[PDB]
Amino acid sequence: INDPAKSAAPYHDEFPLFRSANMASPDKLSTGIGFHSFRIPAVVRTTTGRILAFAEGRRHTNQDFGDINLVYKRTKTTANNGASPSDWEPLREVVGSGAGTWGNPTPVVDDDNTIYLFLSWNGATYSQNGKDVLPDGTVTKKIDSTWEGRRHLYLTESRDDGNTWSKPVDLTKELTPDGWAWDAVGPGNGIRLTTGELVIPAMGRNIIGRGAPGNRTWSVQRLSGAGAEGTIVQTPDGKLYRNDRPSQKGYRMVARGTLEGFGAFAPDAGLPDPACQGSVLRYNSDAPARTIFLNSASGTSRRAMRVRISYDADAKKFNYGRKLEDAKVSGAGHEGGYSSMTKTGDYKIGALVESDFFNDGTGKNSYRAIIWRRFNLSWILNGPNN
Ligand SMILES: [Cl-]
Numbered sequence: 426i427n428d429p430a431k432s433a434a435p436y437h438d439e440f441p442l443f444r445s446a447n448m449a450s451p452d453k454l455s456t457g458i459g460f461h462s463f464r465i466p467a468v469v470r471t472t473t474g475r476i477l478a479f480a481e482g483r484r485h486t487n488q489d490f491g492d493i494n495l496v497y498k499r500t501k502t503t504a505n506n507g508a509s510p511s512d513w514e515p516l517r518e519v520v521g522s523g524a525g526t527w528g529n530p531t532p533v534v535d536d537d538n539t540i541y542l543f544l545s546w547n548g549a550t551y552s553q554n555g556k557d558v559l560p561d562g563t564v565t566k567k568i569d570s571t572w573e574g575r576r577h578l579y580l581t582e583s584r585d586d587g588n589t590w591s592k593p594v595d596l597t598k599e600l601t602p603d604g605w606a607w608d609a610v611g612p613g614n615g616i617r618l619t620t621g622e623l624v625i626p627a628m629g630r631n632i633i634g635r636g637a638p639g640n641r642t643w644s645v646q647r648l649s650g651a652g653a654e655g656t657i658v659q660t661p662d663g664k665l666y667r668n669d670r671p672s673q674k675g676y677r678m679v680a681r682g683t684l685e686g687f688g689a690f691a692p693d694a695g696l697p698d699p700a701c702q703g704s705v706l707r708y709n710s711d712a713p714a715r716t717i718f719l720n721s722a723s724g725t726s727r728r729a730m731r732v733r734i735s736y737d738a739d740a741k742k743f744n745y746g747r748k749l750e751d752a753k754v755s756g757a758g759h760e761g762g763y764s765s766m767t768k769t770g771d772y773k774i775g776a777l778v779e780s781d782f783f784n785d786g787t788g789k790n791s792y793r794a795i796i797w798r799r800f801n802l803s804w805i806l807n808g809p810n811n
Contacts, residue, residue, distance in 0.1 A: 427713070428713055428734075428736075428802070428806060430801070430802035430803050430806060431802075431803055431806040431807065432803070433801060433802070433803040434803060435801065435803045435804040435807050436773065436799070436800060436801040436803065436804055437752045437798070437799065437800040437801075437804045438508065438509075438798075438799050438800075439752055439754050439796055439797065439798040439799070440509075440510055440754065440796070440797060441754065441756075441757040441780075441794050441795070441796055441797070442478060442498065442507075442513065442777065442795055442796065442797035443463035443466075443478075443480050443496075443498075443516075443794055443795035444463075444757075444794055445460070445461065445462050445463060445758075445782070445792040445793055445794040446459055446460060446461050446462075446792060447782060447784070447792040448756075448757070448792075448794065452496075452515075452516040453516060454496070454516055454517070454518055454521075455515070455517075458484075458494075458518075458521070459484075460482040460483055460484055460494075460496070461483055461484060461485055461486055461487065461790075461792065462483040462486070462487040462792055462793035462794075463480040463481065463482055463483065463496070463793060463794060463795045464480065464481050464483055464487065464762070464763065464779055464793050464795070465480060465481040465528055465529065465530065465612050465702075465763055465779075466478065466479065466480050466530075466612075466613075466763055466764065466765045466777035466778070466779065466795050467479040467480070467530035467531060467532050467611065467612055467613055467614060467765045467777070468532075468614070468765045468766065468767045468775060468776075468777050469532045469533065469534050469540065469614060469767055470534070470767045470768060470769060470770065470775070471503075471534050471538055471540060471586055471587065472534060472536075472538040473503040473538065473586050474503040474504055474506075474770040475499055475500050475502070475503045475586050475587060476499065476500045476506065476507045476767065476769065476775060477497060477498075477499050477532065477540060477587040478497060478498050478499075478507075478513075478777055478795075478797065479495065479496070479497045479519070479530035479532060479542065480495075480496050480497070480530070480777075480795055481493050481494075481495065481496070481527075481528040481529075481530070482494040482495070482496035482516075482518075482521070483793070485560045486560070486789040486790060487789055487790070487791055487792070487793045488552075488557070488789050489526070489528075489552070489553060490526055490547070490551065490552035490553065490557060490559075490565060491524070491526065491549070491552075491559055491560065492524040492525070492526075492549065493525075493526040493527055493528050494518055494520065494521030494527055495518070495519040495520045495521070495527040495528060495530060495542075495544060496516055496517065496518050496519065496521075497516075497517055497518070497519055497530075497587070498513050498514050498515070498516055498517065499513070499514050499517075499586075499587045499588075500512055500513060500514070501513065501514055503586070504770065506769040506770050506771045506773070506775075506799070507769070507775060507797060507799070508771075508799065513797075519542065519544075519581060519590045519593075520544070520579075520581065520590070520592070520593050523549060524549040525546060525547055525548045525549040525551075526545075526546060526547045526548075526549075527544060527546055527579075527593075528544065528545055528546075528612070529543075529544055529545035529609055529610050529611055529612040530542060530543075530544060530611065530612055531543040531544070531610045531611030531612055531613060531614060531615055531625055531626070531627075532614055532615070533614060533615030533616060533617065533623050533625060533634075534617070535617065535623065535634075535638040535639045535641070536617065536621075536638035536639075537638040537639040538584075538586065538639075539582050539583070539584055539638065539639030539640075540582060540583045540586075540587055541580060541581075541582050541615070541623070541625075541634075541641075542580070542581050542582065542583075542590070543578065543579070543580055543610045543611065543615070543625055543627075543632070544578070544579040544580070544581065544593060544610065545576055545577070545578060545579070545608060545609055545610055546576070546577040546578075546579050546593075546595075547568060547574075547575075547576050547577070548573055548574065550563060550565055550566055551565055551566050551567070551568050551569075551573075551574050552565040552566075552567070552568065553567075553568055553607060554567060555567025555568070568606050568607050569606050570604050570605065570606045574606070575597070575605060575606050575607075575608070576601075576605070576606065576607050576608035576609070577595055577597040577601075577608075578595075578596050578597050578600050578601050578608060578610055578627075579593035579594065579595055579596065579597075580593060580594050580596050581593040581594070582639070584639070596643070599643065600627075600632055600643055600644075600645055602629075602630075602645070602647075607628075607653075608627070608628050609627065609628045609653045609654055610625065610626075610627040610628070610632070611625070611626055611627070611654070611655070611656075612654065612702060612763065612765075613626075613656055613702065613704050613763075613764075613765045614656075614704070614765060614767075615632075615657065616657055616658060616659060616707070618659050618665075619659065619663060619710075620663075622634060622635050622684065623635075623641060624657050624659075624665065624684075625657070626655035626656055626657040626667065626669075627655065628651070628652070628653045628654070628655070629647065629648055629651050629653075630645050630646060630647050630648055630651065631645070631646040631648065631655075631657065631665075631667075632644075632645060632646075633645070633646055633684060646684065646686075648667070648680070648687055648690075649687075649689070649690075650678075650680070650689060650690040651667060651669055651678075651680070651690060652669030652670045652671065652672065652678055652690075653670065653672075654669065654670040654702045655667055655668070655669040655670070656668045656669065656703055656704060656705045657705070658705045658706070658707050658716055658740070659707055660681070660707075660716060660737075660738060660739050660740045661710055661714035661716070661737075661738045661739075661740075662738040662739055664681055664682065664683060664739065665681065665682050665683055665684070665687070666679070666680075666681050666705070666716075666739070666740055667679065667680045667681075667682075667687065667690070668693075668696075668703060668705050668718070669690065670698065670700060670701060670702055670703065671692070671698060671700055672700070673700060674698070674699050674700045674724050674725065675692060675697070675698065675700075675724055676692035676693055676694060676696055676697055676698055676724075677692070677693045677696040677698045677703060677720065678690045678691070678692060678693075679691060679692075679693045679696075681739060695742055695743060696718070696720065696722070696743065697722055697723055697724045698720050698721065698722075698723075698724070699721055699723050699724055699725055699726055699727055699729075701720065701721055701727050701762060701763065702720075702762075702763040702764070703718065703719060703720035703764065704718070704719045704720070704763075704764045704765050704766045704776075705717065705718050705719075705766075706718075706719075706766040706767070706768065706774065708734075708768065708774075708802075713736050714736065714738070715734050715735065715736060715802070716734070716735045716737075716740040716743075717732065717733070717734060717735075717766060717774060718732070718733045718734075718735065718740075718743050718746075719731070719732045719733070719764045719766055719776060719778075720764070721761055721762075722746075722748075726761070727761040727762050727779075727781075728759055728760065728761035729748070729761065730748065730749035730750065730760060730761050730764070730778060731745075731746050731747065731748055731749070732746050732747055732749065732774070732776070732800070732805055733745065733746030733805075734746060734802070734805060734806070744811060745808070745810050745811050746805055746808060746811070747804065747805045747807075747808030747810070747811070748808070748810065749776075749778065749798065751808060751809070752798070752800070752804075754780070754796050757780050757794050757796055758780040758781050758782035758783065758792065758793070758794055759780060759781050759782070759783055760778055760779075760780045760796055761778070761779065761780070761781070762778065762779025762780070762781065762793075763778075763779045764776060764777060764778045764779070765777045769799065772801060773799045773800060773801050774799070774800055774801070774802075774805075775797065775798070775799050776797075776798040776799075776800070777795055777796070777797055777798075778795065778796045778798060779793060779794075779795055779796075780793065780794045780795065780796050781793055782794070
């Protein structure tokens with residue numbers, strides 16, 4: 426019941442990291458290529474201490490389809506922990522080839538500091554629902570099971586602390602079941618287990634990496650009743666824990682297991698969710714061991730961002746935690762949406778969170794930005810609603 430972290434001085438700081446086209450100093454590539462919106466964050470700390478932040482750079486609108494590039498920023502040094510805006514490099518690109526969709530960043534850092542980045546891809550003229558109008562008036566086809574029309578799974582990696590990235594390699598035939606149309610990996614992050622394997626959450630399955638770090642053999646672990654957008658953590662007991670976006674608004678869907686198989690998914694009544702992506706983080710294993718969870722704690726709204734701690738060996742129950750709105754950002758829209766968390770080298774949690782200007786309401790022209798937050802366990806534990 427005692428957590429020494431509560432006695433530490435509370436710390437928080439927050440600022441926009443991916444600045445949409447409507448903001449002052451909007452984020453653009455060195456090529457001059459700009460983006461209406463940034464969505465779908467992912468963040469990892471590498472073995473050097475450098476922080477890598479990934480996002481979908483949505484070129485023309487905030488929509489999930491059309492020309493979308495996979496963009497990123499690194500901390501300028503391995504030691505600055507992204508503490509202030511000046512600690513971050515300008516926007517770079519992992520991949521932006523063609524006018525199709527490169528997205529769903531799902532990174533994991535291997536033992537050798539190879540940073541793997543799993544990605545989803547679809548063609549320029551396809552969308553999840555089909556019949557969507559593109560900027561030039563073209564009407565999309567519905568994503569289907571054909572090679573051209575299906576969702577692909579790609580893998581790129583960096584061997585130089587995120588400085589450069591390989592041309593992404595298509596692993597669809599190997600790691601996506603045959604006959605699938607729609608697919609998703611993450612988005613958010615994969616993990617490295619105490620036992621040495623990599624686990625990457627995906628739609629209806631886990632991707633498992635075995636063998637030599639940065640030289641892994643990949644395989645698929647099929648799951649029953651998993652969601653499209655999943656998260657994975659190793660709980661203090663050493664078991665695996667999937668915490669997935671539900672198909673309908675309500676609660677997070679949770680299953681527990683091992684590399685040999687999982688039990689059933691069931692709603693976690695303690696974790697309301699509006700059918701949106703979430704994020705989970707293994708903080709520490711020594712007493713008191715902690716798992717961190719972040720989503721919108723609402724059955725209806727994405728604007729109820731809440732970070733929580735679980736002390737349970739199986740992460741059975743999370744505390745109330747703290748509303749991110751307790752440390753609100755101004756000038757970057759209405760915060761809430763997808764999120765991603767890492768530990769920093771200075772004993773903080775670093776979180777990326779989507780934000781929405783809502784200037785076009787629910788419409789395609791509403792600018793979307795991504796906020797970077799740092800806070801310590803003390804900040805969470807000293808929340809007024811605990
Ligand atoms: Cl969504």
